[PDB]
Amino acid sequence: PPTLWSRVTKFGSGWGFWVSPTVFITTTHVIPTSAKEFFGEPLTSIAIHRAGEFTLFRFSKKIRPDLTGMILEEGCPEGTVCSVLIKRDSGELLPLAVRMGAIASMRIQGRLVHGQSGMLLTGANAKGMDLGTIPGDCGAPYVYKRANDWVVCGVHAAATKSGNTVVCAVQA
Amino acid sequence: APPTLWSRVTKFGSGWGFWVSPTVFITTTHVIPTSAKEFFGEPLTSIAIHRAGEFTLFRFSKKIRPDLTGMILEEGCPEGTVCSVLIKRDSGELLPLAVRMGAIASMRIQGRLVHGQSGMLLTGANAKGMDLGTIPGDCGAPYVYKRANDWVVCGVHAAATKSGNTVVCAVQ
Ligand SMILES: CNCc1cccc(Cl)c1
């Protein structure tokens, strides 16, 4: 049985997530701007749907036939605790709990980012402990368990260097 | 978590243990093979075993791990401390699970009576199972945290509840 973690894939300047054998999601700003193929498939044959910082790829053949299709939703109810599935180039896996809030345009460092706001639940500092996000983590998925079903509801877009606030980019 | 801490995490019996120094190895009592008379090629004869419930410390009369520096072992940590549990999973994947620590507790978990420092996972809200939580093969994994300039070890993994949200650290 393939774990959720096998779906998290290094991509461009960050990461993305296999929803099904043909559907891959990522953060718009990590996608290469010079490319003729992705994952060995010509761009000719890839449908790209971009909505702000959320991008969905639909391939015309099965790239990951080992996977079953997962539920993808447009964000989650306010107050849902998601996990952000962060992979690091050390080989570390860092699932971090995030309390999700409203859809909003928020001021994060310099910039306006639109998506579902969240607050990390790992406490005061990261302190140099594995407890917060870094810039290279963009495109990591937000997931939660609902009855028996895993749900993916967006991708990591931005975070304040001051610890607390993250933005999850969502579909549509 | 730093490479030197992962280097100390050792496959042992039905779980793990942890090298505090070149001569001192800690583990959870229930993962030790019951018939074993030799450890790291040394007879029992040559080892000082200190057992307190589900905490076991092995002190060797020679240096088994001379590559290592001795580090600090404490008797649990203050309430509110966020620790990492250093868990190794199928394929050089490294899972430093975030846990908020609480009080010393006595519990009944699936007809075992367990005594140690309780904690709650900070990985997600319904953490049951291998992607966001602990599995029985994780017993003996160390609980560590960073204090100013230093890292500390403060116990080893002993148990988790049926729900997976509560864990117990065995302490010296
Ligand atoms: C059920 N939601 C989790 C949570 C996290 C942090 C604070 C509160 Cl009020 C609730």
Coordinates of C-alpha atoms and ligand atoms in Angstrom, one line a residue:
Chain A
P1 CA 0.0 0.0 0.0
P2 CA 1.5 3.4 -1.0
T3 CA 1.6 5.8 1.9
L4 CA 0.5 9.5 1.5
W5 CA 4.2 10.4 1.5
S6 CA 5.0 8.6 -1.8
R7 CA 2.6 11.2 -3.6
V8 CA 4.9 14.1 -2.4
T9 CA 7.4 14.7 -5.3
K10 CA 10.3 17.2 -5.8
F11 CA 9.3 19.7 -8.6
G12 CA 10.8 22.9 -9.9
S13 CA 12.0 25.1 -7.0
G14 CA 9.7 23.2 -4.5
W15 CA 7.3 20.2 -4.4
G16 CA 3.9 18.9 -5.7
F17 CA 1.4 16.1 -4.9
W18 CA -0.1 13.2 -7.0
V19 CA -3.9 13.3 -6.5
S20 CA -4.3 10.3 -8.9
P21 CA -2.3 8.5 -11.6
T22 CA -3.0 11.5 -14.1
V23 CA -3.5 14.5 -11.7
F24 CA -0.6 16.4 -10.1
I25 CA -1.0 19.7 -8.0
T26 CA 1.6 22.4 -7.1
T27 CA 2.2 26.0 -6.2
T28 CA 2.2 28.2 -9.4
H29 CA 5.5 30.1 -8.5
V30 CA 7.7 26.9 -8.2
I31 CA 6.8 25.7 -11.8
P32 CA 9.8 26.1 -14.3
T33 CA 9.2 29.0 -16.8
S34 CA 11.5 27.2 -19.5
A35 CA 10.3 23.6 -20.2
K36 CA 9.3 21.3 -23.2
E37 CA 8.2 18.3 -21.0
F38 CA 7.3 17.3 -17.4
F39 CA 7.8 13.7 -16.0
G40 CA 8.8 12.6 -19.5
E41 CA 5.5 13.8 -21.2
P42 CA 5.5 16.6 -23.8
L43 CA 3.8 19.8 -22.7
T44 CA 1.8 19.2 -26.0
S45 CA -0.1 16.5 -24.0
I46 CA -0.5 18.2 -20.5
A47 CA -3.6 20.3 -19.6
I48 CA -2.5 23.1 -17.2
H49 CA -5.3 24.8 -15.0
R50 CA -3.9 27.9 -13.1
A51 CA -5.9 29.8 -10.5
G52 CA -3.6 32.3 -8.7
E53 CA -1.0 30.3 -6.6
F54 CA -2.8 26.9 -7.3
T55 CA -1.9 24.9 -10.4
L56 CA -3.4 21.5 -11.5
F57 CA -1.8 19.3 -14.3
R58 CA -3.9 16.6 -16.0
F59 CA -1.7 14.1 -18.0
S60 CA -3.1 12.1 -21.1
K61 CA -1.4 8.9 -19.8
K62 CA -1.0 7.2 -16.3
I63 CA 2.3 8.5 -14.8
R64 CA 1.7 7.0 -11.3
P65 CA -0.5 3.9 -12.0
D66 CA 0.4 2.5 -8.5
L67 CA -1.9 5.2 -6.9
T68 CA -5.7 5.3 -6.4
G69 CA -7.6 8.6 -6.9
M70 CA -8.0 10.9 -3.7
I71 CA -10.7 13.5 -2.9
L72 CA -9.5 17.0 -3.9
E73 CA -11.7 19.9 -2.4
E74 CA -11.6 23.7 -2.7
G75 CA -10.1 24.4 0.8
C76 CA -11.8 23.0 4.0
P77 CA -14.3 24.2 6.7
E78 CA -13.0 27.0 9.0
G79 CA -11.4 25.4 12.1
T80 CA -10.3 22.1 10.4
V81 CA -6.8 21.0 11.6
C82 CA -4.8 20.0 8.4
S83 CA -1.3 18.5 8.1
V84 CA 1.2 20.1 5.8
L85 CA 3.2 17.2 4.4
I86 CA 6.8 18.7 4.2
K87 CA 9.7 16.8 2.6
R88 CA 13.3 18.0 3.1
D89 CA 16.4 17.2 1.0
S90 CA 17.9 15.5 4.1
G91 CA 15.3 12.6 3.8
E92 CA 13.3 14.1 6.7
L93 CA 9.4 13.9 6.6
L94 CA 7.8 16.8 8.7
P95 CA 4.0 16.5 9.1
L96 CA 3.0 19.8 10.8
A97 CA -0.6 20.5 12.3
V98 CA -2.1 23.8 11.0
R99 CA -5.5 25.3 12.2
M100 CA -7.2 26.5 9.0
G101 CA -9.1 29.9 9.0
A102 CA -10.8 32.1 6.4
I103 CA -10.1 32.6 2.7
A104 CA -8.5 36.0 2.4
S105 CA -5.9 38.2 0.7
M106 CA -3.1 38.5 3.2
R107 CA 0.0 40.6 3.6
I108 CA 2.9 38.0 4.0
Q109 CA 6.4 39.7 4.1
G110 CA 6.2 42.2 1.1
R111 CA 3.3 40.7 -0.7
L112 CA -0.4 40.0 -1.2
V113 CA -1.2 36.2 -1.4
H114 CA -4.8 34.9 -1.8
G115 CA -5.8 31.6 -0.2
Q116 CA -6.9 29.9 3.0
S117 CA -5.1 31.3 6.0
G118 CA -3.7 28.9 8.7
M119 CA -1.9 29.0 12.0
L120 CA 0.9 26.4 12.9
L121 CA 0.2 24.5 16.1
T122 CA 3.8 23.6 16.9
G123 CA 4.3 26.5 19.4
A124 CA 6.3 29.7 20.2
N125 CA 9.6 29.1 18.3
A126 CA 10.7 26.5 15.8
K127 CA 14.0 27.6 17.6
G128 CA 16.1 25.5 15.1
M129 CA 13.8 22.5 15.9
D130 CA 11.9 20.8 13.0
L131 CA 8.6 22.8 13.9
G132 CA 8.1 25.3 11.0
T133 CA 8.2 25.9 7.2
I134 CA 11.1 27.3 5.1
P135 CA 11.0 28.8 1.5
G136 CA 12.0 25.6 -0.3
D137 CA 8.8 23.8 1.2
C138 CA 6.4 25.6 -1.3
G139 CA 4.0 23.2 -3.0
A140 CA 3.7 20.8 -0.1
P141 CA 0.1 19.5 0.2
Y142 CA -2.5 20.2 3.0
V143 CA -4.4 17.0 4.0
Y144 CA -6.9 15.8 6.7
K145 CA -8.8 12.6 7.5
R146 CA -12.6 12.8 7.3
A147 CA -14.4 9.6 8.5
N148 CA -12.4 6.9 6.5
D149 CA -11.3 9.3 3.7
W150 CA -8.1 11.3 3.2
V151 CA -8.9 14.7 1.7
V152 CA -6.3 17.1 0.0
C153 CA -7.5 20.7 0.0
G154 CA -4.6 22.7 -1.3
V155 CA -0.8 23.5 -1.6
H156 CA 1.7 25.5 0.6
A157 CA 2.0 29.1 -1.1
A158 CA 3.6 31.4 1.6
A159 CA 4.5 31.9 5.3
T160 CA 5.6 34.7 7.6
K161 CA 9.4 34.4 8.6
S162 CA 7.8 35.4 12.1
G163 CA 6.6 31.8 12.8
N164 CA 2.8 31.8 13.0
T165 CA 0.8 32.3 9.7
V166 CA 0.8 30.2 6.5
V167 CA -1.3 30.4 3.2
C168 CA -2.8 27.3 1.5
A169 CA -3.6 28.1 -2.2
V170 CA -6.9 26.4 -3.2
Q171 CA -8.6 25.3 -6.5
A172 CA -11.1 27.6 -8.3
Chain B
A1 CA 17.3 17.2 13.8
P2 CA 21.1 17.0 13.5
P3 CA 22.8 14.1 11.8
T4 CA 24.7 13.2 15.0
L5 CA 21.3 12.5 16.7
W6 CA 20.1 10.3 13.9
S7 CA 23.5 8.4 13.9
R8 CA 22.7 7.3 17.5
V9 CA 19.3 5.8 16.6
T10 CA 20.0 1.9 16.4
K11 CA 17.7 -1.0 15.2
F12 CA 17.4 -3.2 18.3
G13 CA 15.2 -6.2 19.1
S14 CA 11.6 -5.5 18.0
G15 CA 12.2 -1.6 17.9
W16 CA 15.1 0.9 18.6
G17 CA 17.5 2.2 21.1
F18 CA 19.8 5.3 21.5
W19 CA 23.5 5.8 22.1
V20 CA 23.9 8.6 24.8
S21 CA 27.7 8.2 24.8
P22 CA 30.3 5.6 23.6
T23 CA 29.4 3.3 26.6
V24 CA 25.7 4.1 27.4
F25 CA 22.7 2.7 25.4
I26 CA 19.0 3.4 26.4
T27 CA 15.9 1.5 25.2
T28 CA 12.3 0.5 26.1
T29 CA 12.3 -2.7 28.3
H30 CA 9.7 -4.6 26.2
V31 CA 11.8 -4.5 22.9
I32 CA 14.8 -6.4 24.5
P33 CA 14.9 -10.0 23.3
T34 CA 14.2 -12.1 26.5
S35 CA 16.7 -15.0 25.8
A36 CA 19.6 -12.6 24.8
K37 CA 23.0 -13.1 26.5
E38 CA 25.2 -11.0 24.2
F39 CA 24.9 -7.3 23.0
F40 CA 27.3 -5.7 20.5
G41 CA 29.5 -8.8 20.9
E42 CA 29.8 -8.4 24.8
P43 CA 28.6 -10.9 27.4
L44 CA 26.0 -9.8 30.1
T45 CA 28.9 -10.3 32.6
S46 CA 30.5 -7.2 31.1
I47 CA 27.4 -4.9 31.2
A48 CA 25.7 -2.8 34.0
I49 CA 21.9 -3.0 33.3
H50 CA 19.7 -0.4 35.2
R51 CA 16.0 -1.1 34.7
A52 CA 13.1 1.2 35.9
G53 CA 9.8 -0.2 34.5
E54 CA 9.8 0.4 30.6
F55 CA 13.1 2.4 30.8
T56 CA 16.4 0.3 30.5
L57 CA 19.9 1.7 30.4
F58 CA 23.0 -0.5 29.4
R59 CA 26.5 0.7 30.6
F60 CA 29.3 -1.2 28.8
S61 CA 32.8 -1.7 30.3
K62 CA 34.4 -0.8 26.8
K63 CA 33.6 1.9 24.2
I64 CA 31.2 0.4 21.6
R65 CA 30.6 3.8 19.8
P66 CA 33.9 5.8 20.0
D67 CA 32.7 8.0 17.0
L68 CA 30.2 9.7 19.5
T69 CA 30.5 12.4 22.2
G70 CA 28.5 12.0 25.4
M71 CA 25.4 14.1 25.5
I72 CA 22.9 15.1 28.3
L73 CA 20.2 12.5 29.4
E74 CA 17.5 14.1 31.7
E75 CA 14.6 12.5 33.7
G76 CA 11.7 13.7 31.3
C77 CA 11.2 17.5 30.6
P78 CA 9.0 20.4 31.9
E79 CA 5.3 20.4 30.8
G80 CA 4.7 22.4 27.7
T81 CA 8.1 21.4 26.2
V82 CA 7.8 20.5 22.4
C83 CA 9.9 17.4 21.7
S84 CA 10.8 15.4 18.5
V85 CA 10.5 11.6 18.5
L86 CA 13.3 10.4 16.2
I87 CA 11.5 7.7 14.1
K88 CA 13.1 5.8 11.2
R89 CA 10.7 4.4 8.5
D90 CA 10.8 2.0 5.5
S91 CA 13.6 3.4 3.3
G92 CA 16.0 5.9 4.9
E93 CA 13.0 8.1 5.5
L94 CA 13.4 10.0 8.7
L95 CA 10.2 11.1 10.7
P96 CA 11.0 13.6 13.6
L97 CA 7.4 13.6 15.0
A98 CA 6.5 16.8 17.0
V99 CA 4.9 16.1 20.5
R100 CA 3.7 18.5 23.2
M101 CA 4.7 17.0 26.6
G102 CA 2.5 16.8 29.7
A103 CA 2.5 15.3 33.2
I104 CA 3.9 11.9 34.5
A105 CA 1.0 9.4 34.0
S106 CA -0.1 5.8 34.8
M107 CA -2.5 4.4 32.0
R108 CA -3.9 1.2 30.7
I109 CA -3.3 0.9 26.9
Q110 CA -4.7 -2.4 25.3
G111 CA -4.2 -4.5 28.5
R112 CA -0.7 -3.2 29.3
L113 CA -0.2 -1.0 32.4
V114 CA 2.1 1.8 31.3
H115 CA 4.0 4.5 33.4
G116 CA 5.9 7.5 32.0
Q117 CA 5.7 11.1 30.7
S118 CA 2.5 11.6 28.6
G119 CA 2.4 13.8 25.4
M120 CA 0.1 14.8 22.5
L121 CA 1.1 14.6 18.9
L122 CA 1.4 17.9 16.9
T123 CA 1.4 16.3 13.5
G124 CA -2.4 16.3 12.7
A125 CA -5.8 15.9 14.5
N126 CA -6.5 12.1 13.8
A127 CA -3.0 10.8 13.8
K128 CA -3.8 7.0 14.0
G129 CA -1.5 5.0 11.7
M130 CA 1.9 5.3 10.0
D131 CA 1.6 8.6 7.9
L132 CA 1.2 11.1 10.8
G133 CA 1.5 8.8 14.0
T134 CA 3.4 6.0 15.7
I135 CA 3.3 2.2 15.0
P136 CA 4.3 -0.6 17.5
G137 CA 7.7 -1.0 15.7
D138 CA 8.7 2.6 16.8
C139 CA 9.1 1.5 20.5
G140 CA 12.6 2.7 21.9
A141 CA 12.8 5.8 19.6
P142 CA 14.2 8.8 21.5
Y143 CA 12.4 12.0 22.6
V144 CA 14.8 15.0 22.2
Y145 CA 14.6 18.8 22.3
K146 CA 16.9 21.8 21.8
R147 CA 17.8 24.0 24.9
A148 CA 19.7 27.3 24.0
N149 CA 23.0 25.9 22.4
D150 CA 22.6 22.1 23.3
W151 CA 20.3 19.1 22.4
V152 CA 18.9 16.9 25.3
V153 CA 17.4 13.3 25.3
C154 CA 14.7 12.9 27.9
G155 CA 13.1 9.4 27.3
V156 CA 12.3 6.6 24.9
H157 CA 8.9 5.7 23.1
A158 CA 6.9 3.2 25.3
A159 CA 3.3 3.3 24.0
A160 CA 0.4 5.1 22.1
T161 CA -3.3 5.1 22.7
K162 CA -5.8 3.4 20.3
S163 CA -6.8 6.9 18.9
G164 CA -3.0 7.6 18.3
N165 CA -3.2 11.2 19.7
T166 CA -1.6 10.4 23.1
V167 CA 1.9 8.9 23.5
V168 CA 4.0 7.8 26.5
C169 CA 7.8 8.4 26.9
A170 CA 9.6 6.0 29.4
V171 CA 11.9 8.1 31.7
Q172 CA 15.0 7.3 33.8
Ligands
LIG1 C1 -10.6 21.4 17.0 N1 -9.6 22.4 16.6 C2 -8.2 22.4 17.1 C3 -7.8 23.7 17.9 C4 -6.5 24.1 17.8 C5 -6.1 25.3 18.5 C6 -7.0 26.0 19.2 C7 -8.3 25.6 19.3 CL1 -9.5 26.6 20.1 C8 -8.8 24.5 18.5

